[PDB]
């Protein structure tokens, strides 16, 4: 083919064919001319070699290189590899009617919606728009329709709004590890250039909003639209196919909000009032007359599903808090009150959703999941939870533990030079000592942190779980864990040399105190080892799953 | 004590340690290297001199003619750097070499009096390095990264079984030359020794020895120890060396003929050996049973007959012993085969060895190296010699020789490049020693074994390759033709040498586009050391071992800055203070400790040398210019850290920074960050995009001044003086008389680069920061680069953050920003791009650049010139025409309906296309300039020649200053001489300057000097004239172009890019995010006083990611802005100077034990007021890494500014007015805007262009392509039941041709049906398989 | 000529030395070059090849196909409204 610059671009098969033809013609010439036998033997070998290089290059030992430096690519090369026909153009291929962009959180969406930029939508649905511009008579011919669209007249936007309605689109994020990586959503047109994704579906996609991108595809035929709506729609995928457990699982901010709203506290505003149901609880809290944590007595009516599915109503006077009463207004009728009446963590919320599913069905759980998300965001924001540096408390007796362990190790090392202790004995003893010291420090830190608040209960003192923000993030299961907090406030611990051996002296400092040069250099070993492990482990995972998919 | 750019704004730092070394010049690693390549060194063999002296003189075959080397020289480059960039041509210099051809005489033996013909030869182009460390290749800035490769020498490694039940440890030794083939020895699992040449195939290891003309007896001699048996007419007696008996169960009793020593059954002890040793036992009458088992050394012939009774290396037998006795041999030299402490490996290899003599051994090697050829004598001889012992085919560079000798525990350092036979035998010796358990195995990752190549050395290597390629042709031509008529420049072809050099610079893997995001990326790119590249390790070959952090990296390479993904650990950055010794191994500085006192002598220690000593730590508490405070110190030795006494220390680290690189040294509170996030932060700083208005960091570390100055992107005063005139584009400066050179006038001109385009399409612009009349000293900043504030690095801008959850708009790493940030034009960037329209001449006719373009209404042609080019400054949007070009169209036969249509309406339908250049869709900007390039023969349009006229005007304008500044100096010398032969104080001054030459004094030497000066003025005139004519000729002459290209037009388009949801922002501590929403000002949370927060971040990102740098930085930033607000309030009350002085000074000396003492009293009132003006925006603070500002100091600083010491505030909700129930953290954090913009990333496609052979849509946003529906996605749809969407994705959307066009025409009609077909890719497959001669075809039904 | 002048020769000077007209030299210079392989790796990483980068020119656009069909239909409708003999004459003349 002619390149624009006047040059020509050619495939390699042209070259291989040319030399086969050349050798063949010259062999015919030689035989016609009655040559000596060594010459014709030479020609016969070279012809055979040319054919071999045509059919499969390099298998005959030495690959014929092109003009440049590199071997010519032959027919078998066009079939075989990862980049041959079979895997690259037949089993998976590039596609029309598709787009791609950065993702962003939209918290106002319902579980079956996704925000689609106006420009992407205008481009993807081009021919549909041409068709309905012609239908209404607004454009005589297709070329007029083009000019109408490229100048973006208002009727174009009205037509587009009428087109996308009820039309699902397919959202994909690579790598597509499991069948939940592709899901169908109903679009809502937005301005801007980023796709807005519902918060709850991030877990399935394994997506985080720090620069990821997703691809959008458009189903065209009626059958494609229907099976996007029936098989693939996001409200149809709430349980995982690997194990039976749900995948719509509220997470970081939702869990923090629900935890903060539900938890109870000592005497704070409004002890021992008696309330006519949750509505009064909300009216009290939002007027500033009571706190979310007050321990109050509220009148509550549960429903309970009968033998034949009837809902019997039961009314009673329960002991609860303002926060739990307010939360109860969301819960669909059919569930017991006992679900809400304890300080909810992550497990509790997931179990709440599972119960609602296996009792009531699908539609109530979808609506319930949304309302949980909305309430969790709202009250997490109203809590105003933050993170300062004073929030990472350090035990008052850390240095005592460290000094005792140091002196004891010093004496065991002094005892070594008496010859009473071999190398293995000393090494094992020192490691055991430092492990014990680490455990003591960690336990003291948790004791000081977890249940440290002393409150007057209208009189003398009382002891309750603390409202420290990092502890909240620990208990609620929002984001923290015990080990992370240990690193923030206890000791960072023991480290390992590049490969196996565990270094003798541990790191006694923590991130609030700050490491020194040598300790930082020590930790870098493990950091890089883990990071390289993940980087080079992804490929093995992929190859394994490919083999498994092909067998079965 | 402070320079003026410092008294403008002193940044308070909290560092406690006193610094000894200054941070060295950062780019030296580049510059120094290249200098060695060009520096004209007489004896020091570096670069061009070394290469020439290596090849030349080149001897002809007959020895009668030879070509001789004299010297070389670098010509002046024809084009300057700016011209090279605008013309797209390499910046280079011509290399000119003096050669001498000498022709001998046949008759006389060496009569060299026939012909000596000497002349200069042009021998290629050499690219030059700009003074910043970069090359300009084809008009683009390229950087060549240093390479880290395994040094030549010997390495003794082991692969311990790694697959065996035995788990045997297998030892091997490698010899690696600088240039040449590999030699490898190893053990077989059966303790046999084998050789590989160039990793082809094993041979038994003794063949190398035999090829070296060694007789079997001689081999057994040099390896093994000899044992002596006397025979006395009946007696078998052995000469005894006592310790030879160690470690053996007793066989019989051994009496030394006087008294029993070893009884049968007694285990032989050290006491027995000692008894033997003192008893001086020599000869033992051993039983005849003993020698049954040993091996004979020499060839024992029968002296009576001369026949081999037993030759070397056969196990002895009783009857053989008898025959030796009867033959008359009293002496028997058997072999010393004492188990594991000594080993019988050589003997066993000899027994397996098939070859017998030298010649058979050479034949064996020859048929191993070149299988299938007859092994003649001469061929084998020549092969072996050229293989390992020939000067031009093997080289252990002096580095390799030194490393070799020092691995072998030799004395000398310098030696021949070729391997002697002693070298091979010694390597074998040491390998065997390791096998028996004496020596140790080398560690291949040691930075004592890995060495770095810089650009000078690679370029020198490639030039040598080119020179050798010339050698062949020169030497053959010297032999055949007649030697009389020809001259040397006819013999040499320049093309191959320049071919090699330019191929290296342009196409190598180590020549890379330079990153011009900002100064930091530039510096950190010029300083990486890469393990990949030619002659180096590759991706798949790299295991886990080479990729980790070795204990010797301390202070040589950074541990926490390296890419993620596949290249982790393979690319890594040079640390701060590190440099390279003359061999090429990294080394780092240390303070020498004399007898307890820490001195100030700096010694640079290498990798292998470091482990010998005991090195203290950087933060060990020193005591008042003396010895250590503590009795016991923390140190490291032999790779292990432990505790030591004062007396045992030898060295101390220079500073706390010397571990980390530059990019990591810029992070404020590094010592509180988990390493995983520090790595990310270091990698992410390099991607920041420089915004409209530079803003200093309120929390820095003090390395910013050095980075900004050394990156070369500012304009730094060269010799100092007083500013005489400042413009937006120029600074002219009068020099102080002290450093005014005695010939010239003291005026320096600095021209500033304004609004040029970088590699990443950002804006480069310099702004003057000096003001007219100000005094400046040497080395301080006059202009600010792209992303530098008043002398300092300023990558991003610093914002009010609150740490709290909004209504789920910052869910996972998302960021919520206020509308104020958009209003203030913070984070607004400027992007410059090229657009080019090329007009060629086609076979039907030449295309042309015209404004007369078919099918276009005047609305579009509004913005075009008369000639069809855009007006400068016209604002364009997507789709507009930038230059009108039409191409001659062929003949177009249309279907009947167009015949009818044209007949109805009378359309002429002219024969010409519309190929004009238009703005890409979406882009919207302003045209800042246009450039036109015309071929030599083509006439110049109107537009092009008015551009030329404008350029002439500019050139004449500029050249006049250059003329005047030179007349001024010449007249200064004239007035300095004319007053010395008679002072005329005011007379000459008042009379005109010019007519001083028409005046003359007494006919002394004064008159002669006045005349000879007058003949300087006449050729200053000719300077002006020739230079002006050079400029006239350059811009009038037609540019050379590609063949077939008539003319080129380039349009530069400038786009102002604003922030919007979707963009990526980040801080310095590894925290990322995408803007999620832009709130109105009312909705943002607000303070007690009503000031709203600018950015809201999520708390849940700190505890688990575990980087606490964020929070400490936020508190310290709050404190710094607090002091700023005190200063501002004090200034708004319209003055009180003593109070400003007092408050500022107490703020400056707040710290606990800081080293920085700022005496404010010496400042005059005006400088104090100016300093207050600059601090009005906040006190800038500096907390160095690992020497930080600690928490109590932060709280004290907060108290000084009247802020809560806990760092948290009562914060209200801007939307309902209700207070948030808990205090929240508020403060200033330094945010960055990265180069991943949502504008560049959005893309959509309905239908477009399709590929050629496969017929699928193309890929990529440039080609308007579609997204790939890979294999995994297909599995996903398989996992549902979605068969119909699948069949859609496979047929009517990409390959099914008839299918896809039919379905378009359907969905236009509102039908929505498929009608599928057969993908073209499968038909292509089917034809490919049929072409293999395999019949595959579809069975019908 | 390059080693004599110390730089590359302009086509005019080269034409002077070969005693041939300038256009002939220019024509030879453009003819000389040899075609480039479709498998040359254009991406720095050896994943993408020149071949994937080239577009097919022969195909028409679905837009223009639909336009042509619409044009034919419209012309048929307009012609049908005309007089029978006039309509058949116009069809017969232009080969519609
Ligand atoms: Mg992510």
Provide structural commentary.
This is part of a larger assembly, with chains A (552 residues), B (1341 residues) and C (96 residues). Chain A is α/β, with parallel strands linked by helices and 552 residues long. Chain A has a domain at 389-537: RNA polymerase Rpb1 funnel domain (Topoisomerase I, Chain A, domain 4, Orthogonal Bundle). In chain A, 48% of the residues lie in helices and 12% in strands. In chain A, strands 4-6-5-8-3-7 form a 6-stranded mixed beta sheet. In chain A, strands 9-10-11 form a 3-stranded mixed beta sheet. A two-stranded antiparallel ribbon of chain A has the order 12-13. The longest helix of chain A is centred in the last third of the chain and has 35 residues, at 517-551. Chain B folds into 9 domains: 25-151 and 444-574, no CATH class; 152-224 and 343-443, RNA polymerase Rpb2, domain 2 (Dna-directed Rna Polymerase Ii 140kd Polypeptide, Chain: B, domain 3, Alpha-Beta Complex); 225-342, no CATH class; 575-655, DNA-directed RNA polymerase, beta subunit, external 1 domain (Rna Polymerase Beta Subunit, Chain: C, domain 4), CATH 2.30.150; 656-712 and 788-827 and 1058-1241, Beta Barrel (Dna-directed Rna Polymerase Ii 140kd Polypeptide, Chain: B, Domain 6), CATH 2.40.270; 713-787, OB fold (Dihydrolipoamide Acetyltransferase, E2P); 828-938 and 1039-1057, RNA polymerase II, Rpb2 subunit, wall domain (OB fold (Dihydrolipoamide Acetyltransferase, E2P), Beta Barrel); 939-1038, Helix Hairpins; and more. In chain B, the strands form 17 sheets. A 6-stranded mixed β-barrel of chain B has the order 43-56-44-55-54-59. Chain C has 96 residues and is mostly helical. Chain C contains 5 helices and 1 strand. Chain C has helices at residues 2-5, 11-18, 22-31, 62-81, 84-94; one strand at residues 36-37. Chain C starts with a helix and ends with a helix. Strand 2 (93-94) of chain A pairs antiparallel with strand 61 (1268-1269) of chain B. Bound molecules: magnesium ion. Magnesium ion binds next to loops of chain A. Chain B: Its EC number is 2.7.7.6. Chain B: Pfam families: RNA_pol_Rpb2_1, RNA_pol_Rpb2_2, RNA_pol_Rpb2_3, RNA_pol_Rpb2_45, RNA_pol_Rpb2_6, RNA_pol_Rpb2_7. Chain B: DNA-dependent RNA polymerase (RNAP) catalyzes the transcription of DNA into RNA using the four ribonucleoside triphosphates as substrates.
């Amino acid at each position: 083919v002619p390149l624009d610059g006047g040059r020509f671009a050619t495939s390699d098969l042209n070259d291989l064919y040319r030399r086969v033809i050349n050798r063949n013609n010259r062999l015919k010439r030689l035989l016609d001319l009655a040559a000596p036998d060594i010459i014709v033997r030479n020609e016969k070998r070279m012809l055979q070699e040319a054919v071999d290089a045509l059919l499969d290059n390099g298998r005959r030992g030495r690959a014929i290189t092109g003009s440049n430096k590199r071997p010519l690519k032959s027919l078998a090369d066009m079939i075989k590899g990862k980049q041959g026909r079979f895997r690259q153009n037949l089993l998976g291929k590039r596609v029309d009617y598709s787009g791609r962009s950065v993702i962003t959180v939209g918290p106002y969406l319902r579980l079956h919606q996704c925000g689609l930029p106006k420009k992407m939508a205008l481009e993807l649905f081009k021919p549909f728009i041409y068709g309905k511009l012609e239908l209404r008579g607004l454009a005589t011919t297709i070329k007029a329709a083009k000019k109408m669209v490229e100048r973006e007249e208002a009727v174009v936007w009205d037509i587009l709004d009428e087109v996308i309605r009820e039309h699902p689109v397919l959202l994909n994020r690579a790598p597509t590890l499991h069948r939940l990586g592709i899901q169908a959503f109903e679009p809502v047109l937005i301005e801007g250039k980023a796709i807005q994704l519902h918060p709850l579906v991030c877990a399935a996609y394994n997506a985080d909003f720090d620069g990821d991108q997703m691809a959008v595809h458009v189903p065209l035929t009626l059958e494609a639209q229907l099976e996007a709506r029936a098989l693939m729609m996001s409200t149809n995928n709430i349980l995982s196919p690997a194990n039976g457990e749900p995948i719509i699982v509220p997470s970081q901010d939702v869990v923090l909000g629900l935890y903060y709203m539900t938890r109870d506290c000592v005497n704070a505003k409004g002890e021992g009032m008696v309330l006519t149901g949750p509505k009064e609880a909300e009216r009290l809290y939002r007027s500033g007359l009571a706190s979310l944590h007050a321990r109050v007595k509220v009148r509550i009516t549960e429903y309970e599903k009968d033998a034949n599915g009837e809902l019997v109503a039961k009314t009673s006077l329960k002991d609860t808090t303002v926060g739990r009463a307010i939360l109860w207004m969301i819960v669909p009728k059919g569930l017991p009150y006992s679900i809400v009446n304890q300080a909810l963590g992550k497990k509790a919320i997931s179990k709440m959703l599972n119960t609602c599913y296996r009792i009531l069905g699908l539609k109530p759980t979808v609506i319930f999941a949304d309302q949980i998300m909305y309430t969790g965001f709202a009250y997490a924001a109203r809590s105003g939870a933050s993170v300062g540096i004073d929030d990472m408390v350090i035990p008052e007796k850390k240095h005592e533990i460290i000094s005792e362990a140091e002196a004891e190790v010093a004496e065991i090392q002094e005892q070594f030079q008496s010859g009473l202790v071999t190398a293995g004995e000393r090494y094992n003893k020192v490691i055991d000592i430092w492990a014990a010291a680490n455990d003591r420090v960690s336990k003291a830190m948790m004791d000081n942190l977890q249940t440290e608040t002393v409150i007057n209960r209208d009189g003398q003192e009382e002891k309750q779980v603390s409202f420290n923000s990092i502890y909240m993030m620990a208990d609620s299961g929002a984001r923290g864990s015990a080990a992370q907090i240990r690193q923030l406030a206890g000791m960072r611990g023991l480290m390992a040399k590049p490969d196996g051996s565990i270094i003798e002296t541990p790191i006694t400092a923590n991130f609030r105190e700050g490491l020194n040069v040598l300790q930082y250099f020590i930790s870098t070993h493990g950091a890089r080892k883990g990071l390289a492990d993940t980087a080079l482990k992804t490929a093995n995972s992929g190859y394994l799953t490919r083999r498994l998919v092909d067998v079965a | 004590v402070y320079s003026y750019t410092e008294k403008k704004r002193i940044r308070k730092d909290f560092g406690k340690r006193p610094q000894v070394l200054d941070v060295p010049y950062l780019l030296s690693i580049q510059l120094d290297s290249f200098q060695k390549f060009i520096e004209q060194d007489p004896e020091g063999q570096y670069g061009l001199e070394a290469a020439f002296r290596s090849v030349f003189p080149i001897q002809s075959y007959s020895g009668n003619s030879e070509l001789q080397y004299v010297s070389y020289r670098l010509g002046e480059p024809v084009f300057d750097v700016q011209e090279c960039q605008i013309r797209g041509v390499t910046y280079s210099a011509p290399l000119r070499v003096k050669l001498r051809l000498v022709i001998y005489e046949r008759e006389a033996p060496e009569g060299t009096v026939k012909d000596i013909k000497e002349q200069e030869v042009y021998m290629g182009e050499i690219p030059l390095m700009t003074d910043n460390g970069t090359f300009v290749i084809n008009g683009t800035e390229r950087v060549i990264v240093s390479q880290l490769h395994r040094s030549p020498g010997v390495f003794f490694d082991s692969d311990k079984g790694k697959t065996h039940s035995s788990g045997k440890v297998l030892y091997n030794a490698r010899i690696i030359p600088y240039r040449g083939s590999w030699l490898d020895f190893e053990f077989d699992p059966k303790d046999n020794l084998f050789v590989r040449i160039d990793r082809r195939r094993k041979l038994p290891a003794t063949i190398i020895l035999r090829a070296l003309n060694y007789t079997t007896e001689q081999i057994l001699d040099l390896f093994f120890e000899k044992v002596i048996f006397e025979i006395r007419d009946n007696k078998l007696q052995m000469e005894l060396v006592p310790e030879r008996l160690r470690g053996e169960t007793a066989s019989f009793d051994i009496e030394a003929n006087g008294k029993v020593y070893v009884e049968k059954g007694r285990r032989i002890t050290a006491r027995h050996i000692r008894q033997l040793e003192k008893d001086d036992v020599k000869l033992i009458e051993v039983p005849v049973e003993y020698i049954a088992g040993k091996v004979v050394a020499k060839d024992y012939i029968d002296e009576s007959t001369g026949e081999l009774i037993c030759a070397a290396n056969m196990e002895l037998s009783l009857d053989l012993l008898a025959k030796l006795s009867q033959s008359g041999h009293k002496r028997i030299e058997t072999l010393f085969t004492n188990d594991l402490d000594h080993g019988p490996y050589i003997s066993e290899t000899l027994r397996v060895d098939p070859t017998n003599d030298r010649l058979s051994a050479l034949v064996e090697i020859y048929r191993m190296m070149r299988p299938g050829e007859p092994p003649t004598r001469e061929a084998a001889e020549s092969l072996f010699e050229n293989l390992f012992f020939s000067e031009d085919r093997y080289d252990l560079s002096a580095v390799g020789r030194m490393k070799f000798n020092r691995s072998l525990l030799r004395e000398e350092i310098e030696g021949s490049g070729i391997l002697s036979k002693d070298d091979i035998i010694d390597v074998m010796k040491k390998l065997i020693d390791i096998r028996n358990g004496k020596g140790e195995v080398d560690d291949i990752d040691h930075l004592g074994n890995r060495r770095i190549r810089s650009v000078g050395e690679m370029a020198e290597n490639q030039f040598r390759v080119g020179l050798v390629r010339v050698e062949r042709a020169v030497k053959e031509r010297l032999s055949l033709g007649d030697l009389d008529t020809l001259m040397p420049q006819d013999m040499i072809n320049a093309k191959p040498i320049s071919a090699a050099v330019k191929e290296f610079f342009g196409s190598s893997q180590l020549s890379q586009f330079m990153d011009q995001n900002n100064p930091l990326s530039e510096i950190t790119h010029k300083r990486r050391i890469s393990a990949l590249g030619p002659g180096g390790l590759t991706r798949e070959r790299a295991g886990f071992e080479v990729r980790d952090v070795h204990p010797t990296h301390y202070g040589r390479v950074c541990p926490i800055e390296t890419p993620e993904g596949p290249n982790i650990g393979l690319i890594n950055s040079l640390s701060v203070y590190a440099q390279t010794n003359e061999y090429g191994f990294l080394e780092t500085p240390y303070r020498k400790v004399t007898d307890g006192v820490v001195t100030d002598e700096i010694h640079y220690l290498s990798a292998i040398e470091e482990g010998n000593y005991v090195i203290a730590q950087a933060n060990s508490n020193l005591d008042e210019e003396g010895h250590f405070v503590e009795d016991l110190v923390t140190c490291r030795s032999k790779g292990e850290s432990s505790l030591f006494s004062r007396d045992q220390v030898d060295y101390m680290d220079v500073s706390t920074q010397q571990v980390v690189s530059v990019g990591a040294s810029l992070i404020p509170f590094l010592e509180h960050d988990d390493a995983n996030r520090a790595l990310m932060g270091a990698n992410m700083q390099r991607q920041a995009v420089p915004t409209l208005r530079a803003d200093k960091p309120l929390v820095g570390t003090g390395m910013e001044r050095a980075v900004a100055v050394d990156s070369g992107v500012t304009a730094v005063a060269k010799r100092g003086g007083v500013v005489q005139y400042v413009d937006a584009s120029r600074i002219v400066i009068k020099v102080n008389e002290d450093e005014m050179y005695p010939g010239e006038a003291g005026i320096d001109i600095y021209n500033l680069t304004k609004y040029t385009r970088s590699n990443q399409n950002t804006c480069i612009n310099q702004m003057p920061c000096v003001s007219l009349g100000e005094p400046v000293e040497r080395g301080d900043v006059l202009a600010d680069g792209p992303s530098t504030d008043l002398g300092e690095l300023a990558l991003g801008q610093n914002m009010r953050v609150a740490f709290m959850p909004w209504n789920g708009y910052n869910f996972e790493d998302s960021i919520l920003v206020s509308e104020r940030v958009v209003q203030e034009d913070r984070f607004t960037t400027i992007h410059i791009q090229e657009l080019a329209c090329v007009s060629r001449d086609t076979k039907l006719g030449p295309e042309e650049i015209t404004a007369d373009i078919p099918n276009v209404g005047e609305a579009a042609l509004s913005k075009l010139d008369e000639s069809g080019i855009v007006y400068i400054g016209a604002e364009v949007t997507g789709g507009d025409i930038l230059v009108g070009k039409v191409t001659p169209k062929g003949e177009t036969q249309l279907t009947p309906e167009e015949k009818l249509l044209r007949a109805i309406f009378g359309e002429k339908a002219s024969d010409v296309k519309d190929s004009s250049l238009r703005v890409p869709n979406g882009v919207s900007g302003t045209v800042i300039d246009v450039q036109v390039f015309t071929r030599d023969g083509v006439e110049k349009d109107k537009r092009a020649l008015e551009i030329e006229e404008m350029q002439l005007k500019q050139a004449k304008k500029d050249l006049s200053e250059e003329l005047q500044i030179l007349e001024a100096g010449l007249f200064s010398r004239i007035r300095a001489v004319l007053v010395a032969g008679g002072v005329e104080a005011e007379k000459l001054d008042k009379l005109p300057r010019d007519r001083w030459l028409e005046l003359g004094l007494t006919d002394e030497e004064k008159q002669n000097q006045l005349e000879q000066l007058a003949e300087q003025y006449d050729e200053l005139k000719h300077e002006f004239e020739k230079k002006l004519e050079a400029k006239r000729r350059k811009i009038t002459q037609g540019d050379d172009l590609a063949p077939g290209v008539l003319k080129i037009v380039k349009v530069y388009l400038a786009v102002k890019r604003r922030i919007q949801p979707g963009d990526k922002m980040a801080g310095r501590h590894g925290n990322k995010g995408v803007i999620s929403k832009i709130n109105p000002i009312e909705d943002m949370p607000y303070d007690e006083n009503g000031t709203p927060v600018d950015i809201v971040l999520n708390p849940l990102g700190v505890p688990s990611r575990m980087n606490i740098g964020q929070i400490l930085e936020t508190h310290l930033g709050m404190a710094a802005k607090g002091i700023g607000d005190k200063i501002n309030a004090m200034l708004k009350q319209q003055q009180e100077v003593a109070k400003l002085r007092e408050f500022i000074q107490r703020a400056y000396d707040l710290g606990a034990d800081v080293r920085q003492k700022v005496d404010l009293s010496t400042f005059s009132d005006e400088e104090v007021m100016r300093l207050a003006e600059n601090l009005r925006k906040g006190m800038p603070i500096a907390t160095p890494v690992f020497d930080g500002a600690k928490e109590a100091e932060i709280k004290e600083l907060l108290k000084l500014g009247d802020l809560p010491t806990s760092g948290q505030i009562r914060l209200y909700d801007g939307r309902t007015g209700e207070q948030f129930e808990r205090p929240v953290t508020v403060g200033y954090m330094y945010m960055l805007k990265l180069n991943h913009l949502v504008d560049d990333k959005m893309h959509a496609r309905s239908t477009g262009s399709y590929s050629l052979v496969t017929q699928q849509p193309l890929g990529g946003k440039a080609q308007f392509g579609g997204q790939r529906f890979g294999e995994m996605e297909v599995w996903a749809l398989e996992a549902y039941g979605a068969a119909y969407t699948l069949q859609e994705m496979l047929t009517v959307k990409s390959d099914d041709v008839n299918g896809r066009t039919k379905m378009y025409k359907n969905i236009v009609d509102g039908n929505h049906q498929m009608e599928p077909g057969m993908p073209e890719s499968f038909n292509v497959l089917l034809k490919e398989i049929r072409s293999l001669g395999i019949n595959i075809e579809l069975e019908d039904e | 000529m390059l080693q004599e002048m110390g730089r590359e020769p302009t086509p005019e000077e080269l034409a002077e030395r070969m005693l041939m007209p300038e256009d002939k030299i220019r024509k030879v210079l453009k003819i000389a070059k040899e075609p480039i392989s479709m498998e040359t790796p254009i991406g720095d990483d050896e994943d993408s090849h020149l071949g994937d980068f080239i577009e097919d020119t022969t195909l028409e656009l679905p837009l223009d196909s639909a336009t042509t069909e619409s044009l034919r239909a419209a012309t048929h409708d307009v012609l049908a409204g005309l007089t029978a003999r006039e309509a058949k004459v116009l069809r017969m003349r232009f080969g519609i």
